[PDB]
Amino acid sequence: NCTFEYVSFKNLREFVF
Amino acid sequence: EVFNATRFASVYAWNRKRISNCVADYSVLYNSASFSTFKCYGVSPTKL
Numbered sequence A: 001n002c003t004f005e006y007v008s009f010k011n012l013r014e015f016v017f
Numbered sequence B: 001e002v003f004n005a006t007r008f009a010s011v012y013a014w015n016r017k018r019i020s021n022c023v024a025d026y027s028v029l030y031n032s033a034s035f036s037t038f039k040c041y042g043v044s045p046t047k048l
């Protein structure tokens, strides 16, 4: 059911999706 | 890994393994001569 799978205040963590 | 797995699944339940995001050396697999029969009904070995 997993067509694709990849495995492997002081801060701000931005993101754009 | 699939072809040279120690245990090959029986005719009863032919196992399905999904491969994605990989470089497919189809030419190298064809180059391997250990497999007695390599038959493509719907694909071209040169074009693979």
Ligand SMILES: *[C@@H]1O[C@H](CO)[C@@H](O[C@@H]2O[C@H](CO)[C@@H](O[C@@H]3O[C@H](CO)[C@@H](O)[C@H](O)[C@@H]3O)[C@H](O)[C@H]2NC(C)=O)[C@H](O)[C@H]1NC(C)=O
Binding pocket: A001
């Ligand atoms: C991914 O989605 C779910 C994960 O929970 C599972 O769905 C099941 O997969 C089977 C076949 O792989 C599908 O069978 C379907 O059943 C209906 C009604 O019985 C029928 O008309 C068809 O034969 C249709 O293919 C169905 O999506 C579902 N099984 C059931 C009993 O509902 C499965 O792990 C994964 N695959 C699919 C296709 O969802």
